[PDB]
Design a binder for this molecule. Structure first.
Ligand SMILES: N[C@@H]1[C@@H](O)CO[C@@H]1CNC(=O)Nc1ccccc1
Ligand SMILES: N[C@@H]1[C@@H](O)CO[C@@H]1CNC(=O)Nc1ccccc1
Length: 340
């Protein structure tokens, strides 16, 4: 690796650690924003488009209900998400601008990305050509090189978590499963189609699970469907652990060779987890045309520019039932969320 890359990552780790050791807290409040529209929902949280009343800027506000977080055993995960997001800085990660809490909820206010989720675009077009998939994959490779150098495992790669910005580049969102891990970790988490075998088999696992998930993502982008597809999770898991994958005949030979090495069941043989680390991926023939520096600098013209009218346009996101943001008169779960 060239010294310029080594020095970049050394500085990145210094800057991350300073914010990690001393996290920001309580940098806005709810009544500074107007609520516009729900952009996504989950079992313990939602994301809403909001507008800051004084500046007029738009943001995406993630709202987590403290009592639901406790019931679903996500306390440590939500504390990880905020502490990591307030400490990272990289071109292809969503930017956390504010965070705060109140009697009922936790709030993470992120920059709004108007192009929508990669998932929508992939399903609308069918599949991406190899150059188009490779443009996105290169950004994920650089983002995982950055996160892993900070001892962070991401653990939620899937097309829904990759937002497309106004220049057609990726912003990775949802750090709800991200964790700082030196060595192994054990939690069962992630979406079924993207889980590495060692997660399914309840082993201690490491950053190699993110490189497996990259293989699933590249396959899905280039084929239009994931490699271990089946109707119910137990059937998906049986396919994941089996060591077999069928490739469409339209895949290039280089793409199939890269995917055999990312979708390697034995983690000790998986690309990204060998002696040369991420460089076995960056130097693979499928990436021969990739200018890694130009991608990082956002100098490549993107394959696809989302269609939207302005920073408040939500047309690339879909419609959800609109529910109130209720805040109890009494503090809930104060002790559990003291550090947030
Ligand atoms: N599954 C998660 C649940 O809390 C509901 O939606 C979450 C995922 N969605 C986003 O993070 N969306 C987004 C959109 C624009 C900018 C920043 C973020
Ligand atoms: N297709 C674009 C559309 O906005 C109109 O013309 C633009 C031309 N640029 C590219 O396609 N760039 C690119 C870069 C990397 C990989 C694949 C493609």
């Amino acid at each position: 690796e060239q010294e310029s890359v080594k020095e970049f990552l050394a500085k990145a780790k210094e800057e991350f650690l300073k914010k990690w050791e001393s996290p920001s807290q309580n940098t806005a409040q709810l009544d500074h924003f107007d609520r516009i529209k729900t952009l996504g929902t989950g079992s313990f949280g939602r994301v809403m488009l909001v507008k800051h009343k004084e500046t007029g800027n738009h943001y995406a506000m993630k709202i987590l209900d403290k009592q639901k977080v406790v019931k679903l055993k996500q306390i440590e995960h939500t504390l990880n998400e905020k502490r990591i997001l307030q400490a990272v800085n990289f071109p292809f990660l969503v930017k956390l601008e504010f965070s705060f809490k109140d009697n009922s909820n936790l709030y993470m206010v992120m920059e709004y990305v108007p192009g929508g989720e990669m998932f929508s675009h992939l399903r609308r077009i069918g599949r991406f050509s190899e150059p188009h998939a490779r443009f996105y994959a290169a950004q994920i490779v650089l983002t995982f090189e950055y996160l892993h150098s900070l001892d962070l495992i991401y653990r939620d790669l899937k097309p829904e978590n990759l937002l497309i910005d106004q220049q057609g580049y990726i912003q990775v969102t949802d750090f709800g499963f991200a964790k700082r891990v030196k060595g192994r970790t054990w939690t069962l988490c992630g979406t079924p189609e993207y889980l590495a075998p060692e997660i399914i088999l309840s082993k201690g696992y490491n950053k190699a699970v993110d490189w497996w998930a990259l293989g699933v993502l590249i396959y899905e982008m280039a084929a239009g469907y994931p490699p271990f597809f089946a109707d119910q999770p137990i059937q998906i898991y049986e396919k994941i652990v089996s060591g077999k994958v069928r490739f469409p005949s339209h895949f290039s030979s280089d793409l199939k060779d890269l995917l055999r090495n990312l979708l390697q069941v034995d983690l000790t043989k998986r690309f990204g987890n060998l002696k040369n680390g991420v460089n076995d991926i960056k130097n693979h023939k499928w990436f021969a045309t990739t200018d890694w520096i130009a991608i990082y600098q956002r100098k490549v013209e993107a394959p696809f520019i989302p269609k939207f009218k302005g920073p408040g346009d939500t047309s690339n996101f879909d419609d959800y039932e609109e529910e109130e943001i209720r805040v109890s008169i009494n503090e809930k779960c104060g002790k559990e969320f003291t550090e947030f």
